[PDB]
Amino acid sequence: EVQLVESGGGLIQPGGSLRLSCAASGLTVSSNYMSWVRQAPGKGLEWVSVIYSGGSTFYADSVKGRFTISRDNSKNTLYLQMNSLRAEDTAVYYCARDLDVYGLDVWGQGTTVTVSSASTKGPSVFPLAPSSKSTSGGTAALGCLVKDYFPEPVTVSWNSGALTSGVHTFPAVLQSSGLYSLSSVVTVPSSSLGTQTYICNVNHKPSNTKVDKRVEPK
Amino acid sequence: EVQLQESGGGLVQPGGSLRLSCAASGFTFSSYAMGWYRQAPGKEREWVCAISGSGGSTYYADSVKGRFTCSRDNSKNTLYLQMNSLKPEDTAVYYCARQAWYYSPYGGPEFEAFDYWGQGTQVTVS
Amino acid sequence: DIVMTQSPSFLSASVGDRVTITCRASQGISSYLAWYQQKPGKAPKLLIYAASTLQSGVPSRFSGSGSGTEFTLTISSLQPEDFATYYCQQLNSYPPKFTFGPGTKVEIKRTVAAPSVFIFPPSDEQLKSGTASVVCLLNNFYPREAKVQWKVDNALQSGNSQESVTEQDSKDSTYSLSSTLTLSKADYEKHKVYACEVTHQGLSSPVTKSFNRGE
Amino acid sequence: NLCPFGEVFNATRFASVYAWNRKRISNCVADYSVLYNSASFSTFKCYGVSPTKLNDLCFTNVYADSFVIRGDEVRQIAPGQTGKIADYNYKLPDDFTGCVIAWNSNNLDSKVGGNYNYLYRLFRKSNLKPFERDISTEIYQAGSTPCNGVEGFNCYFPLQSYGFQPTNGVGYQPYRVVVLSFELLHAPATVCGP
Ligand SMILES: *[C@@H]1O[C@H](CO)[C@@H](O)[C@H](O)[C@H]1NC(C)=O
């Protein structure tokens, strides 16, 4: 069927280089307007570049001279060479077929490019101890603070997955230091603070760090 | 068919000097005006110098006038940009391009860059 | 440059409501406008082109109107799969080829529920490292419009706090919010009263949870 | 006789850019001061010639091309430019010797509901050669399945209509463009100044 398959994204330092590839089926790249669209974390959509069927290439002002769009008809694949990468370029990159007034009808699944503005750092886990100020009668709240890690993602489980109800793992936030922070909380009975072992299991694959922290009451 | 390749850039200190070169091919070099352009990270591409095909008429931007010299060798196919008394504001990727000079009913020579670009050369002043 | 704006930013509606999202243009763009739908983790899907024509495969409940500076995307009967973020896109523009709007998120309407506010003092382990972080938690509340105001010795604090909000829960369609105020150990020791003031539509008056340093 | 620039500049309706009109100018006397002394032109750029010295010159071949485009595409009517108009509708040569004249026509070519008579070629497989006109209406094949005159997926009409409305911004407003081509060769002249 018709489909655009993207690949070629990862983590890279500022001034680095990477090449995105958008393999196509059900349409001919060399005969269509082919565009790249990127979506920054938590932001909207922005056009990046477009290649015409006649070969003319147009780029956004923020990427002109650094990014190069190209295609290979023998492989029916659309390319996006990204050089001199900066922190502005971290986003999910989408390849799409442009029909001008008829819009962008076919899209690819997307490829994440995270330029390494900060070094790959493991997370420091700090306990959010339950207390009277965190007690709601018969139910109490506790959790762990996962701070100063790069890049995404981090996986947090509670009691090796044995505790799921009441678990709220919040979306990550990027601090001013360029490092991500996250908090996972769980609401548990106040009478179980002295009988049940509450442990948060934080795993950060890029840094190969696995931390299990027991959240203790009082 | 037109091919433009820039060279000569690098790391330079304020008050220093660099010579840029642009090898051209795929067209009649002497029949087309040429110009140097630069784009700094975060700002739009800006025109630097403009030189006629014969090289008898040269024009410069106010920010580089008295510091940058634009020249060409039509025997070869190379365009030159001699930059003197460099300052940190000159840090950018410098491009060479063909350009068409147009005149208005009351104005003089005005430049329009051909939308064909090479890789450019990096000049960092610090 | 022509600026594309969308109103509202967050829309709450139930299944079966008529939902109208407006996209505005700084200058007249005739019918050069397209509508897209994006779900979390999913690539955008085209819904309408030419500001009125419906793309093949799109349900008839989606409709587009307007030409010039004001455009609207109308859903006659909101369906459970229509809860997503919707973008408008100016077409055939200059200098960029096309420009996308800010986007509008459609979420499930539900009875107003007040948040359960919990405060967490910084741990001794993080203190020994030289940093202090205090966390305020808002659990199972609706609507998502909840403000957290950090107060240090009754002085409102800004610029050193960050917030995070969960997506609508699968079971009860409620949100959860976490606010983290980060200070250094030296500045943390310089103050005593740390408070988290929360206003929400379910609260008639703001509710403040607070602790003194050293408890 | 005077050259028929009035029948080109002052025509009631202009041609679409995909089917741009060409009026041959020959065996007449041209007073170009009617153009360069007017303030009704938003664009007046001459390549290889000076606008003030046109009345003092003689030419062997003169052509006048006219079409309607958008305001954001007047820049593409120039040597070395790229875009939908330059690549697929009207291409100027790199060694162009002539003048490009444009003026806003919102009060004439824009209708309240939208004038959809002016068209541009949207889909084409190859860029136009300089001074080339393509008036084909064949269905464009975007994939590998032939269209055979039926419009659908990967099968689109090559011509799309401008939406010209008075509420449109200056970029989307219609602009009437006249391109004058001057050819100076070692041959007897046909068009001269008074
Ligand atoms: C078009 O008509 C106006 C008004 O009559 C006139 O001034 C102008 O010279 C005409 N243009 C040409 C090219 O004759």
Numbering used by the authors:
A (entry chain H): 1 to 82, 82A, 82B, 82C, 83 to 100, 100A, 101 to 214
B (entry chain B): 1 to 52, 52A, 53 to 82, 82A, 82B, 82C, 83 to 100, 100A, ...
C (entry chain L): 1 to 95, 95A, 95B, 96 to 213
D (entry chain A): 334 to 527
What do the authors say?
Here, we describe the production and validation of a discovery library that produces single-domain nanobodies using an engineered human antibody variable gene segment. As a test case, anti-SARS-CoV-2 nanobodies were isolated from this library and pairs of complementary nanobodies were incorporated into an antibody-like molecule that targets the receptor-binding domain using a biparatopic mode of engagement. To understand the structural integrity and epitope propensity of our engineered nanobodies, we determined atomic structures of a selection of our lead nanobodies (LM18, Nb-C2-136, Nb-C4-225, Nb-C4-240, and Nb-C4-255) in complex with SARS-CoV-2 RBD (X-ray crystallography) and SARS-CoV-2 S protein (cryo-electron microscopy). Our structures reveal that these nanobodies adopt a VHH fold as expected.
Twenty-one nanobodies binned to the Class 2, CC6.30-compete epitope (referred to as Nb-C2) and 24 nanobodies to the Class 4, CR3022-compete epitope (referred to as Nb-C4). The CDRH3s of these nanobodies contribute to >90% of the buried surface area on the RBD, and structural analysis showed that the CDRH3 of Nb-C4-225, Nb-C4-240, and Nb-C4-255 forms remarkably similar β-bulge structures to those in the YYDRxG antibodies. These structures use the same tyrosines (as YY in the YYDRxG motif) to form hydrophobic and π–π interaction with highly conserved residues in the SARS-CoV-2 RBD. Meanwhile, similar hydrogen bonds and salt bridges are used to maintain these β-bulge structures. The YYDRxG-like motif ([YY(D/T/S)xxG]) in the CDRH3 found in these three nanobodies was also identified in several antibodies isolated from different convalescent COVID donors. Neither of these biases can explain the convergence observed with the class 4 nanobodies, as the constant VHH region does not make significant contacts with RBD and the CDRH3 diversity was randomly generated using mixed trimer phosphoramidites during oligonucleotide synthesis. We also note that there are additional nanobody sequences that bin with the CR3022 site that contain a YYDRxG-like motif. Several of the bsNb4-Ig where LM18 was paired with a class 4 nanobody (LM18 as LC and Nb-C4-198, Nb-C4-225, Nb-C4-237, or Nb-C4-255 as HC) neutralized all the PSVs with an average IC50 of 30 ng/mL (0.2 nM).
